[PDB]
Amino acid sequence: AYDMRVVKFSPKDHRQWIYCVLYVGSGKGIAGWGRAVAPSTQEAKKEAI
Amino acid sequence: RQHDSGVNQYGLKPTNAYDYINPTNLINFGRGTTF
Amino acid sequence: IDHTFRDAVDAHFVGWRSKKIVEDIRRRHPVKLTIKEFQSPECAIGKLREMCQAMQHYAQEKVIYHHFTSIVANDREASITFAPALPMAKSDSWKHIKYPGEKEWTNALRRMEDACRKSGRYGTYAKSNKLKLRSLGQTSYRVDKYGRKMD
Amino acid sequence: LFFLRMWFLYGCCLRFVLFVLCYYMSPRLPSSGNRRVLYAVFYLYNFVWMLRCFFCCFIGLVMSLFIIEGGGFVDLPGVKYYTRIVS
Amino acid sequence: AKRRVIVPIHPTPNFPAHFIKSAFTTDPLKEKQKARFSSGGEAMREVQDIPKNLEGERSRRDLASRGDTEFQALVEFIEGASYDQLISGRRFKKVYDVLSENDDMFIWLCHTAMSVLNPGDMRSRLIYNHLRILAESVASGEMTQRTAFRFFESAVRSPAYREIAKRQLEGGAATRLAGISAAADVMRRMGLTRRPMSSYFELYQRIVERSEAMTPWGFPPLFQFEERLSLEPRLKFFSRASGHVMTPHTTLHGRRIFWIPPTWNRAGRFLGPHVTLYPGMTP
Amino acid sequence: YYWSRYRMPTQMPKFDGPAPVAAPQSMNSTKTNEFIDPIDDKFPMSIRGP
Amino acid sequence: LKTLDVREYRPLAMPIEFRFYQRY
RNA sequence: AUUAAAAAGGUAUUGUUGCCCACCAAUUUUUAUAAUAAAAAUAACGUGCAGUAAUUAAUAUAUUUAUAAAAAUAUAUUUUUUUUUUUU
Ligand SMILES: [Mg+2]
Ligand SMILES: [Mg+2]
Ligand SMILES: [Mg+2]
Ligand SMILES: [Mg+2]
Ligand SMILES: [Mg+2]
Ligand SMILES: [Mg+2]
Ligand SMILES: [Mg+2]
Ligand SMILES: [Mg+2]
Ligand SMILES: [Mg+2]
Ligand SMILES: [Mg+2]
Ligand SMILES: [Mg+2]
Ligand SMILES: [Mg+2]
Ligand SMILES: [Mg+2]
Ligand SMILES: [Mg+2]
C-alpha cells in the first residue's frame, strides 16, 4: 500500500509525506516486511525496503 | 555508521504504529528543535 | 440600570424583556431603554414603541407605578427613560402609570429624522443582501439552496 | 446490516403501492438540491398504511401503482424505501 | 474572491523541463514559501552514502592504489594554509570523520573492560576468543553494541562460576588489567586500526577521562547503548566529545563564509563580507 | 531568429537528490540563511582566521 | 442526544490500556 | 551595576477572525400525548455568550433558582495548570 500523511513542521509549514507498506520475499524460506513515512514516493519505497 | 540508530535520514525513526499514522511526532517538538 | 438592544428583534424578545424591565422598575431602580444599533430612525422608534406598549400592557396589570421621564432622540442613540414612584405615599398621592403618546412620539421622531439628516447618517448598520443557505423542508415545487422558487 | 429500516416491507423483498402525493425535500449538507419524494399507500390485514419513499424512477404516461424496493442509504434522512418500476 | 490565475509555461530552448517544475509553480498558495535544496554528483555521493560495490578491474585497481585515507584527509585540511586557499571547516570535518571512523568500537571495548565486574580471567584463550569474535562483530555492523555486550556477559565461562569466584573475590570485582591488555590485544590482532598504537591509546584515554566522573563505572541501562532515544553527543559516555540588539538583522555582516552569496534583489544594503568600513592604519 | 543565440548549448544537471550535507532545513522556529554556509561559519575563527 | 458529531475531532493517540483491556 | 536563557493547556486541525451551547419559527417522521406532550431529522429569525484550565476553573450527586444557555449553596473530584519545613 501507498498512502498520504500530512506532516506539520511548523504552524505555517505543512509537508506532504507518503507512507509505504511492503514485504520482501523469496519462496526459498526467507521473507520480511517493512513500512516507512518519507517525503517522496520513491523515498518511502526505498526506506520501507 | 555515522549517527544514531533511532534517528534516520528524515527524522526520528518511527517504530510503533502511532508514528506511522501521526508522523509529525517524528520531527517536531516545541520551539527548540533541530535535526 | 440600562438595557441596550438592537433594532431587529422578535415578538418573543419584546415579551420577556418587557417583563424583565418592569420587574426592575418595581424595585425602585433607574431604567432606560436604548437603541444604539439601527438601520433607520423610523424602525428604531418602531421598537421603542413596541417595548413600551408591551410594558404598559404588562405593568398596569401588576399595578406597579412609574412615570415616563426623558426621551432623547439622537443621531447615535434612540432612547427613553423611566422612573418609579418613591413611596406608597407617592403611589397614593400621585397614582399613575405615565407614558408617551402620539405627540411626543411623532415629535421626537421628526427631531430624530432631522438630527440624523443633518449629520448625514441614517443608521449605524443596515440589513445586508446576503442570503444564507436555508431549507424549507417539504414543498410542492423545486427550490434552490437559499429558499427561492424555480422558474 | 440495519434491520429496522425495512419495517414496512414486513419481511418481503418488494412491495406494491398506490401513488398519492409527490413533494420535494432538501438532503443533508453538504449535498444540496431537491430530492423527489413519493407518498404512497398500501394495505395489509385491512390496515391502510402510508409509506414514504424516494422517487428514483421513470414516469411515462400517467400511472398509479409502483413497486417499492429496499435499501442502501441516501442523502435524504428518513427516506428508507426506494422505487423500482411504475405500473 | 479574485483568485490569482497563473498561466503554465512550457519548456523552451533555454528553459528546460526540470527547471520549470523546480523554479515555477502554478498554485499560488505555494509562492513565497522558502528555498529548496538539491545535490548533484559529489554532494549527492556524500549525502546519500551509497556504499560502493566491488566490481570488475577498475574497482579493484582503485582498491589497490587506494593508499592511506587518514593521511590524505589531513593533508587536504592542512593545505588550507597554502596562500591560494582558505582553512575549511569541511576539510576538518572530513578529517575528523576519518579519525573517528571506528570510535564507537573503542567505546564498546571500554564497557567490556570497565563495565563488568568479574569477567573471568581475561587472559585465558577461551574468554579471549569470546571477546575477539564479538569485537569483530561490533565492527562491520553485524551486531548491535547492546547485543554484543549482553552476549559478552552471558558467554560461557566455567561451571559453578560464582562459587569459584568466592575463592578469589570478596564483592565480586576482579582486577581490570587483564581486561585492558586483552582489549588492546584484540584490536591489534584484529586489523582495526591503520596505525598500530591508536587502538591502545584511544582505549586508555577514554578510560582515564571517565575516571573523574561521579559513579564512573555504572551506566543507566537505556542510555548505555544504542536505543531509540539517546544522549546529546557531548554527554555520550566514553565519547571523544566529553550589535546584540542589531545582531539578528546583522547576520551576514561579520566575516562570513558563504554558500550562495547574497544578490542585489535579496539584500538591499549589504556590501559583501570582505569590506572593512572602519580601517586601521598598518605598515 | 535573434533568440537563436539564447538556446542552452549543453544539457543542464538535473536535480536528482536530497539536500546537501548539513543544509539549513527548517523546524518550528528556525532562523535560516540559505546564504551562510552551515559548516564553515560555525568553525571557530581562531582556527580558520578572519 | 444529538445523534451526530458536532465536532470533528480525531485524537491520534492509542494508549495501550484502551486497546488491550484483557491484560491491563 | 541592575536586570533578563531553561516547567506548562486547545472540542481547533494552515488551528481563536478556530469551533461549539441552549431557548426562539416553519416543516419531516415514530410513537407510552403533563404548563405548551415526548423523542429524532433540520439549513430561517431573534437573544445572548454557556463550554474548549475561556474573563467568578471545570466535572458528578444533592437542594434551590429561571427569557435562554444555566446560576447560588452542600458535599465528593481532577478527564484543572505545581510549586516543594525530615524536630530550627
Ligand atoms: Mg514546551
Ligand atoms: Mg425485520
Ligand atoms: Mg449516502
Ligand atoms: Mg468523530
Ligand atoms: Mg489533543
Ligand atoms: Mg406525529
Ligand atoms: Mg416535541
Ligand atoms: Mg461557567
Ligand atoms: Mg464563555
Ligand atoms: Mg468558566
Ligand atoms: Mg456542573
Ligand atoms: Mg443540579
Ligand atoms: Mg438562566
Ligand atoms: Mg447544575
Short mmCIF file of C-alpha atoms and ligand atoms in Angstrom, two decimals, chain D residues 3-4 6 11, ligand 2:
data_model
loop_
_atom_site.label_atom_id
_atom_site.label_comp_id
_atom_site.label_asym_id
_atom_site.label_seq_id
_atom_site.Cartn_x
_atom_site.Cartn_y
_atom_site.Cartn_z
CA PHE D 3 -32.90 -4.36 10.18
CA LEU D 4 -35.31 -1.65 11.32
CA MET D 6 -37.32 -2.49 6.48
CA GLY D 11 -40.43 -9.48 5.70
MG MG I 2 -37.22 -7.29 10.12
#
